[PDB]
Symmetry: C3
Amino acid sequence: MQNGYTYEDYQDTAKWLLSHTEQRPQVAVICGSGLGGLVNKLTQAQTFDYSEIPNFPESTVPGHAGRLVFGILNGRACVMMQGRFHMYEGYPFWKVTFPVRVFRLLGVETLVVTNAAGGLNPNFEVGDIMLIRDHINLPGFSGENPLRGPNEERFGVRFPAMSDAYDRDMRQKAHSTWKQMGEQRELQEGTYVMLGGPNFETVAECRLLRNLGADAVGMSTVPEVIVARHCGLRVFGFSLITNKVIMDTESQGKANHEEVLEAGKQAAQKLEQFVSLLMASIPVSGHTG
Amino acid sequence: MQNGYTYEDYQDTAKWLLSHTEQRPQVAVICGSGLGGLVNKLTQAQTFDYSEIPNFPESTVPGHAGRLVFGILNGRACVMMQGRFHMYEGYPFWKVTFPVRVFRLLGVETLVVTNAAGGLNPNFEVGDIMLIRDHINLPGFSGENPLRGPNEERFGVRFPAMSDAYDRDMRQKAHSTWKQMGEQRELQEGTYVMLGGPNFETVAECRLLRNLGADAVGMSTVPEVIVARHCGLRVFGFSLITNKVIMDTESQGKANHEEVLEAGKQAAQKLEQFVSLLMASIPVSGHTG
Amino acid sequence: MQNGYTYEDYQDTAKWLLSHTEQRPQVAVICGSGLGGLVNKLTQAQTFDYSEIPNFPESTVPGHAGRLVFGILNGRACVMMQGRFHMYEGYPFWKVTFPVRVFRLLGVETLVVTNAAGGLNPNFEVGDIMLIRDHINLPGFSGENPLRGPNEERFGVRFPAMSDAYDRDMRQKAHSTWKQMGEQRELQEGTYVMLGGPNFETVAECRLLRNLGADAVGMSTVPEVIVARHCGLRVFGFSLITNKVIMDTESQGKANHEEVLEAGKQAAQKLEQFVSLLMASIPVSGHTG
């Protein structure tokens, strides 16, 4: 729709950040669920509450206190969003993706996105890390898209391609790095499907999503990838399989957000060490290279 | 979206009803198409036009005059909506489901939903009664959901599960009761898929819906089930197969709302006797149990 | 939704056109991409910029200057829209389809729609002309429909059927006419699927769309067909396969709008001659029959 944000608004917000921190991030990380503790490994960290940054969507999301943190992670200068915005909260896609365009204006070149998702692929287990190789944007099928409305030429083209959204070179490096970590479990990889939420899927819906080729289901990230790729950002992400969805009517139980503990505690730790290692493989700047 | 209705609005409406009728319903029934004559078997019935109840969405739906009726059906005190609201009419999901939350505030514990649907499953025949076992909420895939926006803790949780939406015990009782009625035709059961409407599906669309596992297609009910399950209501419903959809391009005809007569006359009668019998199987209160 | 246009607005716009041109079109053509040069074969042509016609949606679409042209094409009086409106531009469906209802009020009886689409069907080649036999309206699954809101009885019914949307007799005539042209390539025919856009599909999304039975993917036309069929217009259309979508992650490239040249130049020429020939096969009026 007619995005309430004009190009100038993004620039004003980016200019404000540049005048309050000496940090100049090259990488931006959007933390979903488990990775919320990643902020603790950042050195020379400076925090900003989403509430003090003009034009920034303020949020009351149940999970992580809305704050943007600048700092150095494994020799790389980066900025991370500790907590994201979701459509199910009431925000339209142009609000949820506002920070992505600001990152581009700060000079960021790579965006790393993480989330927690239900595993549809039968071969997945709770705690599995799935490298997002592709996605299915269901809201986009009905015209719900962050790029809807008049295109801002200063950010990208009118009809951007999405077939190469997930940087191949990074997925290659992620696999090598996982091997060096000596993990007993293999690093999964697959396509993520986004739904609006906030309720959890029914058995019928999960079987449908699986037939369509989806490996994991979630309620975010996709709009952020579209906007990131639209403005030229290199993109790669990970889903933390927090639960194995039930595909049988003879359900031994039902879904709930207990995932904060499940995976969010055990698999999240590894996920942090993982992203920290990857900072050294991202091309140019940041480190002494 | 930001639901125009605040918690207080639901309470004000519920308080108004309590001060105008001595009736205290334990069960709520939403009548779709055929079951519109169910109001005639209610004893000690009191009628309210949707127009006289504050905050209630007023409607001009082609089918049944908008009125809420309180009364006793087979020893059970209940309230029924003679006519529902539809998205295709212009109403957003928070408007269509407003009555469901009021029912909860009146102390209702069970919601029975009925509708008329096109039979996708090849084994169905016009006049078939299909017990809704599951559903596929297509509008929900794009973020069109009655729960969209900030959650009202007083009604339910942020991420409610939908896998157990259709009460198993009631589906068990419905089957036993159907047997006692001595019906020649079996009681069908399956998954209902909702579409926005108001136009009827194309051959291509029907084959798609069927492949996805849907047994019947309709333009309502799903949002009501989501909200009902969100606030703790026990739920069970029935679809009246008013027509067998054409899956061939060599179409012997096209769809139209003649269904008011077809099934709406013949199968509706049985559907009424059916729901009347079930009132005695619903757990606790109402009757002398 | 509550369409901002009242019946009177359509009539006022139709009355304005009737008072500015002596032309009385019997056929209306909506040009998509390649067919944009069709306006050049019209005799006794009169042009109107969308900007000078009251109530008409003004546009800034990248492709063809928004103008409505009246004239005679192969002995048939018709009106063509050189450039259409798209949802991805910000327009809701009631805005995009406004001209379709005006055409009906001018006395038009047949609507011909054309577009450019990605070929999903493996048997298609760039430059292929695909007769649209059916469609899958994805935005319609979520309630995004030009007929959403209170029905205007003066245009059509509340629940119009779509199974016979693409006039069979015309598809029969189109095939005969193609044979007379002596084309080396066969005239394709299939179902078109619409997506919101404006970004191009991912590999995962294309495989999904293909599994659902779609032969070609596009970002328009469907809403126009729904409204046309709702008001009684005979409808038939063509998709110009401007590109073969990549269904493999080992992508030799990515999508982009270079299609203006590809097909838009080579296959468009034939497409024009094609529509010009068909003008003589459309039933009654226009010509001396």
